[PDB]
Structure formats: structure tokens, C-alpha cells
Design a protein around this ligand. Structure first.
Ligand code: HEM
Ligand code: HEM
Ligand code: HEM
Ligand code: HEM
Lengths: 146, 141, 141, 146
């Protein structure tokens, strides 16, 4: 990650204020509402027929927390994202067959969910670094594909 | 394709922005230049410092254009025609940047309208901003 | 939108393809899997080995749909309308992957048609493929 | 740049056959014709109104020759592209102001042109190798943007 100490530092401080059970739940949901075609990988969760269903389905809410808690691991391994997410890359590629493009969609929704929580606090300089970051976690997950 | 309830959504969401579509356009742009420096290549004639007057006005022009867009969600193409000729034959902005400007308007909207921004209003604004985008790049070649 | 000459070119380039479609679809799919491997996530059931007979027949089905979209070049939305649902409601292949398959297709017709892959016809064929993609991706949300 | 040795030798093998004066001339013009919006950067080349006028434009020919040259020289340093193009990147960004997305388009037209000259010689595996290279070069040209 070509991340700056002033950057890294903004990413970190804002993260320490994040309710991960909420945000993770909220990010995964919208992914499934705004990019409905991603529902392809989560058929075994239940009804994903409506906005309120998706946000309501706890299998969603739960997978969301798992996902965000791992983003959380990567946010203290910023100088070596690749190594952190290797096992995860191979997994999503060898077993789950997920098209890395979905990773990017998750970032952008992510960034979006975050502007919404911290409102004013989610300044442009802060967004820029997360942008930098969520692309990093993407390439990290995409890099062992074959 | 915009569904009649996507139209009801855009209308409401944008109805709240009201007198602030300007404030908001100027923010969308700032974040776009900050988060995606490549977008700066289309404004070498601008001064892109924080609080620029250029970056201001442009924001109002851009936002103003979305206003006319919503009011005409049914016939966007015609309303945006002159805008689509302008970006097409003169400015000639590579179509990728529309995804960036668009993403930045959302982020912005969310940070300002915590309540209107449901996952449903979210899904529609996206669809809506992409329909503006298609229309402004449908005459490139 | 495709222009008179756009159509004339397209109809002429696919003309010489003739009874090689399947063979060309073949290669094209094949060029795609080797170059952009992420595209292999949609074909986990397939035998994606060099020469796989499963690729060859998929190849055929794909080039047939293109052949037919040329034969309705003036009504592509309703002629491909069926293939449009499929990809939006059953398969659900991300829209970026389309721009990749078009690319590999161009590359292909380019290796087999040195006489007719002229600038003007490359540009025409690029617009064609972009249009087929747009229809197939039009009912995603 | 995950260039494996074989991937690296097929690219050099093929490249040895290119008539660089010529190919650069075709790609640059083709780029200019399949994506008309990229003429904006060369409004001093005179007539670019029809395919013929672009392809036969000596100022265009003269220019594609120059671009391949940098590219030829780039394939002789597959391992320090970033520094090979440092000066050219600053330039395309700070003086010329060129959205780096054009670099990609060029990459693909190039791939389309090389196939057009080598027919069945432009095998799948070889193009795959080439597809990594132009992205590699597209990215090295983008890194000094700021
Ligand atoms: C930062 C981005 C993402 C991260 C960190 C992530 C991470 C994870 C993690 C930690 C698991 C738990 C599996 C395990 O440890 O055994 C998982 C499973 C899974 N992920 Fe991802 N994921 C991301 C994005 C995506 C998205 C975009 C998709 C597609 C929509 C996806 C599809 C799946 C599927 C289908 C499973 C299997 C869950 C199950 O078997 O119940 N992931 N992912
Ligand atoms: C939702 C998408 C967009 C809308 C609705 C929009 C709208 C507008 C409007 C109303 C104008 C002013 C027309 C005039 O000057 O009278 C304009 C000009 C312009 N736009 Fe856009 N725009 C959009 C996206 C973009 C993006 C993606 C780019 C490139 C990053 C861009 C770059 C420009 C430039 C460079 C000008 C002229 C600058 C100047 O005044 O000197 N726009 N646009
Ligand atoms: C112009 C581009 C394309 C055309 C014309 C096209 C056309 C077709 C056709 C005719 C079928 C067979 C459907 C049937 O048997 O009823 C099909 C299936 C399929 N396509 Fe597409 N397709 C295109 C692009 C793509 C791309 C970009 C992807 C993703 C990389 C993709 C992935 C698939 C998959 C996974 C199937 C199902 C195959 C099977 O289950 O046997 N296609 N397509
Ligand atoms: C393979 C990628 C590319 C390479 C290696 C490359 C290389 C070069 C080189 C070596 C120069 C000469 C610099 C000078 O005049 O001092 C140049 C000039 C220039 N380049 Fe690039 N270029 C590439 C792609 C592009 C494309 C895609 C564009 C825009 C479509 C572009 C825009 C320009 C412009 C506008 C000039 C100056 C024209 C003039 O002589 O007045 N380049 N490029």
C-alpha cells in the first residue's frame, strides 16, 4: 500500500470508532440490494426478495460481521495485505468461485456506508485514504486467482 | 431501466437536498479530485485548491443539471441532449470517470442525508446516476 | 447507435466468418480464459483445458447468438431479449466481463480476417459488440 | 508484473518480428479511429476526419513510431517498468494532462493490431502474455500522476 503516515493514521483513527456488527451487517446487505446480481453467491441464506428482507436476514447480518472483522485484520497489516489475505484469496478462488469484481463493489458500498455513519466527520481526505485502502484489500483478495 | 418506484425515490431523496444541490455538487467534485487524482486531467484550467471559486460554480452547474434531470426523469435523453453533445464532441471525457463522479455524489448524499439514505434509496440513486451517465456518453462515437 | 455503415461493415465482417463462427467463438472464449482468468469463475463445471469439447460447443452457441443478432441488427433488444434475462436472472455475470469477451472476440476475428479487419471495420465491430453487451446487461436491476 | 520466464520469452520472441516503425503507426491511428474521443490530444496533427486521413497522416505515423520506441525500450526492462517510464509519466500527467485510461485503450488496440499482423501466430498463450505487458506498461505510465 502506498499509504502515507498522515493517511494510514486517518484510516486507523476513524476505524477505532466503528461498530463492526452494525457496519458489516449494513455493507453486505446493500451490496445485495444495489448489485442484486451478487445474490448469486448467497442462495443458502433465505429470502433475499426485498430490501427489508435482505437487511433483515440474520444469516446476512452474521456473514457481514465475519467479513468486516477480517477487513479489520487487514487494517493492521497494511504494509503486507497480500500475505494476510492469501488463504482468503485461494479460498474465494479455489472453493467459492467469486469474481474479484465483487470485492470492488464491496469497497464502494463500504465507503458509502461509512459516509452515512460519520456524516460530517467523513471528510474528503478521509474518503480518499479509505479508497486507497479498500482497493488494496481488493487486489489483495484477487491476487492468488488463477 | 428506471422503475416507477426508482422515480419516486430519486424524487424524494433529491427533494431533500433542495437549496443545497450546489453545496453538494462542489463537495462531490472535491472528493472526486482527492480520491481519484486522474480526474484532475480534465480541469487543468481550474484551480483545484480547497474552497476554489471555480470548483464552486462548477458544482452548482453540475448539480443544477441533475435537478433538471430529475424533473424530467421520464425524458432524460432530450433534456440532457445538449449536455450529451457537449461532453461528446468538445470535452470528450472518457466514460470511466462518470462512475467516479457518480460514486462521489452518493458518498456525499449519504453523509448529508442520514435518514433518506435507505438501501432502497441507495439502489435507485445509483441506477439513476448511471442513467444520467449512459445518456451523456451515448453520442461519443 | 450503429450507423448505416456500422451495419454494412458488421454484416460484411460476419459475412466472411461464415461456417467458422463456432471455431471463432471457441478461440475467443479460449483467449478469454487464458488472459483474464477471473472469467473462469463462471465456468466451474466446464473442462477449460485446451481443446475442451465443452468449450467448443459453448463456442458455437455464443457465435450463433451473435450471428442472429446481426440478422436482426435493427431489432437487437427484442431479438436477444431471451438471452438478456438468462444473464440477468439465472447466470448473473458481472457486466465487466462482457467488455473482456468482446475484446477477445475482436482479437480473434483480427487473426482470421486480415483482408477485412480494416480500421473502419474494427471501429464498427467494436460498437457492435458494445451494443450486444448493453442489451444482455440491460435488465440487471 | 507476474511475468514468468516463458511468458517473458514469448513476448520477446514475438517482439523480435515486429516492424516497429509500422505497428506503432497502425495502433496509434487505430486508437484514433475506434475511439474518436482521443483525437482531442492531437488537434495539431491536422486532418483526422476520416479513417484514411488518420491512418495516412504522416504526423500520426511519425508519432506512433515514437511511442513504440518507448515501448520497445520498455520490453528490454520488464523488471523496472516503473522507473523506465518515470519521466514519461510525469510528462503525460504534468504537461500533457492525459487521462491514464487512454494508455489502456492503446494497450488493447495494440494487442488487436499484433494479432492482425501475425494471425494464427498470435496464439492464446502469447496474447495472454502480451495482455500482462500492456497493463504493466499502462500502469507504469500512470504511477507518477498525482
Ligand atoms: C473485503 C472483502 C471480502 C472479504 C474480506 C471476504 C471474506 C470472507 C470471509 C472471512 C469468509 C469466511 C469463510 C471462512 O473463513 O471459512 C467469506 C466467505 C464467503 N464469501 Fe467472502 N469476502 C469478501 C467479499 C465477498 C463478496 C464480494 C462475495 C460475493 C458476493 C463473497 C462471497 C463469499 C461466499 C459465498 C462465502 C462463503 C460463506 C459460507 O460458506 O457460508 N465474499 N468471505
Ligand atoms: C453526472 C455526470 C455529469 C454531469 C451531470 C455533468 C454536467 C455538466 C455541466 C452542467 C457542465 C456545464 C455545461 C456548461 O459549461 O455550460 C459540465 C461541464 C464540464 N464537465 Fe461535466 N458533468 C458530469 C460529469 C463529468 C465528469 C465525469 C467529467 C470528467 C471527470 C466532467 C468534466 C467536465 C468538464 C471538464 C466541463 C467543462 C469545464 C469548464 O467549464 O471549463 N463532467 N458538466
Ligand atoms: C456477447 C457476449 C455473450 C453472448 C452473445 C453470450 C451468449 C450466451 C448463450 C447463447 C448462452 C447459452 C444459453 C442457453 O444454452 O440457453 C450463454 C451462456 C452462458 N454464458 Fe453467455 N454470452 C456472452 C457473454 C458472456 C460472458 C461475458 C460471460 C461471463 C464471462 C458469460 C457466461 C456464460 C455462462 C456461465 C453461460 C452458461 C453456460 C452453461 O451453463 O452451459 N457469457 N451465453
Ligand atoms: C504505450 C503508451 C504510451 C507511450 C509509451 C507514450 C509515449 C509518448 C512519448 C515518448 C512522447 C514524446 C514526449 C515529448 O514530446 O517530449 C509522447 C508524447 C505525447 N503523448 Fe504519449 N504515449 C503513450 C500513450 C499515449 C496516449 C494513449 C496518449 C493519448 C491518447 C498520449 C498522449 C501524448 C501526447 C498528447 C503527446 C505530445 C504530442 C506532441 O508531440 O505535441 N500518449 N507520448
Amino acid at each position: 500500500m502506498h499509504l502515507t503516515p498522515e493517511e494510514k493514521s486517518a484510516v486507523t483513527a476513524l476505524w477505532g470508532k466503528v461498530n463492526v456488527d452494525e457496519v458489516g451487517g449494513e455493507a453486505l446487505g446493500r451490496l445485495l440490494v444495489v448489485y442484486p446480481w451478487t445474490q448469486r453467491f448467497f442462495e443458502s441464506f433465505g429470502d433475499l426478495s426485498t430490501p427489508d428482507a435482505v437487511m433483515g436476514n440474520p444469516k446476512v447480518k452474521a456473514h457481514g460481521k465475519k467479513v468486516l472483522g477480517a477487513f479489520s485484520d487487514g487494517l493492521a497489516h497494511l504494509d503486507n495485505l497480500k500475505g494476510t489475505f492469501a488463504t482468503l484469496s485461494e479460498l474465494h478462488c479455489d472453493k467459492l468461485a467469486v469474481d474479484p469484481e465483487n470485492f470492488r463493489l464491496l469497497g464502494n458500498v463500504l465507503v458509502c456506508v461509512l459516509a452515512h455513519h460519520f456524516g460530517k466527520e467523513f471528510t474528503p481526505p478521509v474518503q480518499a485514504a479509505y479508497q486507497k485502502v479498500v482497493a488494496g484489500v481488493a487486489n489483495a483478495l484477487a491476487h492468488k486467482y488463477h | 431501466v428506471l422503475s416507477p418506484a426508482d422515480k419516486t425515490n430519486v424524487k424524494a431523496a433529491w427533494g431533500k437536498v433542495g437549496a443545497h444541490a450546489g453545496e453538494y455538487g462542489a463537495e462531490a467534485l472535491e472528493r472526486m479530485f482527492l480520491s481519484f487524482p486522474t480526474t484532475k486531467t480534465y480541469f487543468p484550467h481550474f484551480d483545484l485548491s480547497h474552497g476554489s471559486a471555480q470548483v464552486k460554480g462548477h458544482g452548482k452547474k453540475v448539480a443544477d443539471a441533475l435537478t433538471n434531470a430529475v424533473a424530467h426523469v421520464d425524458d432524460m435523453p432530450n433534456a440532457l441532449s445538449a449536455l450529451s453533445d457537449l461532453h461528446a464532441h468538445k470535452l470528450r471525457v472518457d466514460p470511466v470517470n462518470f462512475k467516479l463522479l457518480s460514486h462521489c455524489l452518493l458518498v456525499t448524499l449519504a453523509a448529508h442525508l442520514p435518514a433518506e439514505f435507505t438501501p432502497a434509496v441507495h439502489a435507485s440513486l445509483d441506477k439513476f446516476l448511471a442513467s444520467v451517465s449512459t445518456v451523456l456518453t451515448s453520442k461519443y462515437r
